[PDB]
Design a protein around this ligand. Structure first.
Ligand SMILES: COc1cc(-c2cncc(-c3ccc(C4CCN(C)CC4)cc3)c2C)cc(OC)c1OC
Ligand SMILES: COc1cc(-c2cncc(-c3ccc(C4CCN(C)CC4)cc3)c2C)cc(OC)c1OC
Ligand SMILES: COc1cc(-c2cncc(-c3ccc(C4CCN(C)CC4)cc3)c2C)cc(OC)c1OC
Length: 283
């Protein structure tokens, strides 16, 4: 048997503190290759350990292809190979485009579907999984208008999360770290912020909000842990719901849903399954 392992790295589509993502080519087909910095080796090990435990396969989860470790003269090279989504991240997409009602709902219900799949334990199956870094940059847009969730480098099975998206109990260090349900409730908080980011870009009555990240109006770029703690925990601020949403039945329902992801009390927040059911009854 010939085992063709050569991947041609064609163009860099992402670079950050902790590595690069490349569009690559295997056997005439696009793949995405994440090349890890030595600084973020544990994200490669955690995602690899998870996929070695359960081969996740879901339309709303970025599709796994391979984990590769290659010996170099003085270092180890770590690659994660996945499906390639040419339309890029939701974060990217929402700057380039406004949404109609159908596309808005298809995006958010697809994200909820992916997240409920991660969260649910299946017997016979998969362990329950919490993501721990859900945000619009870790969601990819597919050609069919659904999204998929990426980056299980911080996932837990039953590095810290992006500070802008941290739930109040992470910022005030009251999270029950010995309780798996705590980590689901942190993802639900983050989901509510993503829902807000998407809903802003849905047109109603000729009106749309510009793309902004959550808390854009109350914290700096690269907010500190303390910046976020004072907004979210001490002052208990939440993202603004513009008046124009209350003229639109879809955005009225989505505002109620995002409120039920943002309760200070983590156990009051909706579950991913309840969010899907609610979204299927909207419109
Ligand atoms: C090692 O490394 C890489 C390998 C590959 C790759 C290339 N051709 C063929 C294969 C293949 C798959 C499966 C079998 C099975 C057949 C059924 N039998 C009962 C057991 C064995 C054999 C061969 C693979 C896995 C691609 C890669 O990159 C995309 C690799 O690098 C990450
Ligand atoms: C890693 O990823 C890719 C891999 C391959 C690929 C290459 N050679 C062989 C295979 C294979 C053949 C046969 C079995 C057997 C296993 C048990 N039983 C006997 C029935 C089925 C398994 C595996 C595959 C899956 C192709 C891909 O794309 C077309 C891959 O995606 C990039
Ligand atoms: C978040 O996390 C991961 C994401 C990916 C991933 C998968 N498909 C497509 C992409 C992508 C492509 C293209 C753009 C832009 C830039 C170029 N311009 C043309 C506009 C579009 C953005 C993004 C990525 C970044 C893979 C990963 O691992 C292999 C990730 O990590 C787990």
């Amino acid at each position: 048997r010939t085992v063709a392992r050569d991947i041609t790295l064609l163009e860099c589509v992402g670079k950050g503190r902790y590595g690069e993502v490349w569009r690559g080519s295997w056997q005439g087909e696009n793949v995405a290759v994440k090349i890890f910095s030595s600084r973020d080796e544990k994200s490669w090990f955690r995602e690899t350990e998870l996929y070695n435990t359960v081969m996740l396969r879901h339309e709303n989860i970025l599709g796994f292809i391979a984990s590769d470790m290659t010996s170099r003269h003085s270092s180890t090279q770590l690659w994660l190979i996945t499906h390639y989504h040419e339309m890029g991240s939701l974060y990217d997409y929402l700057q380039l485009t406004t949404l109609d009602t159908v596309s808005c709902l298809r995006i958010v219900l697809s994200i909820a579907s992916g997240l409920a799949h991660l969260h649910i334990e299946i017997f016979g199956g998969k362990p329950a999984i919490a993501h721990r870094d859900l945000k619009s940059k870790n969601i990819l847009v597919k050609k069919n208008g659904q999204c998929c969730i990426a980056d299980l480098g911080l996932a837990v099975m039953h590095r810290v999360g992006t500070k802008r998206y941290m739930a109040p109990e992470v910022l005030d260090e009251t999270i029950q770290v010995d309780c798996f349900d705590s980590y689901k409730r942190v993802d639900i908080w983050a989901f509510g912020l993503v829902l807000w980011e998407v809903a802003r870009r849905m047109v109603s009555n000729g009106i749309v909000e510009d793309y902004k990240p959550p808390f854009y109006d109350v914290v700096p770029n690269d907010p500190s842990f303390e910046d976020m703690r004072k907004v979210v925990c001490v002052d208990q601020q939440r993202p603004n719901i513009p008046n124009r949403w209350f003229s639109d039945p879809t955005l009225t329902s989505l505002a109620k849903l995002m409120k039920e992801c943002w309760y200070q009390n983590p156990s009051a927040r909706l579950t991913a399954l309840r969010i899907k059911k609610t979204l299927t009854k909207i419109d």
